[PDB]
């Protein structure tokens, strides 16, 4: 049994931008109310309960390359 795994990746993920700006984010407050009793989180649990979040994200690039290589024998 002979297994050869040799994928080739010469790809390009790119961007160019002249001018990025004059970005205004102005949230008018607000009310969040959460009521619960018992929280039992067992395995690989990701959670957010009760939030009023404000996020401004302005990267010059922000490009992504995600890759998975899985070989199982």
* DSSP H or E stretch at residue 73: none
Breaks in the chain (C–N beyond 2.5 Å) sit after none
Residues between 41 and 60 that touch a second copy (CB under 8 A) = 41-60
Residues between 9 and 48 that touch a second copy (CB under 8 A) = 9-48
Question: Minimum Å distance from CB 67 to a second copy?
Answer: 5
Residues in contact with a second copy, counted by CB under 8 A, come to a total of 73
Contact yes or no for 13/64 (Cβ under 8 A):
yes
Question: Minimum Å distance from CB 58 to a second copy?
Answer: 5
């Amino acid at each position: 049994v002979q297994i050869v795994y040799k994928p080739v990746d010469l790809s390009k993920v790119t961007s160019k931008c002249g001018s990025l700006g004059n970005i205004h984010h102005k949230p008018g407050g607000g009310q969040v109310e959460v009521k619960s009793e018992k929280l039992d989180f067992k395995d690989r649990v990701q959670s957010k309960i009760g939030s009023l979040d404000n996020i401004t994200h302005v990267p010059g690039g922000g490009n992504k390359k995600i890759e998975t290589h899985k070989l199982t024998f």
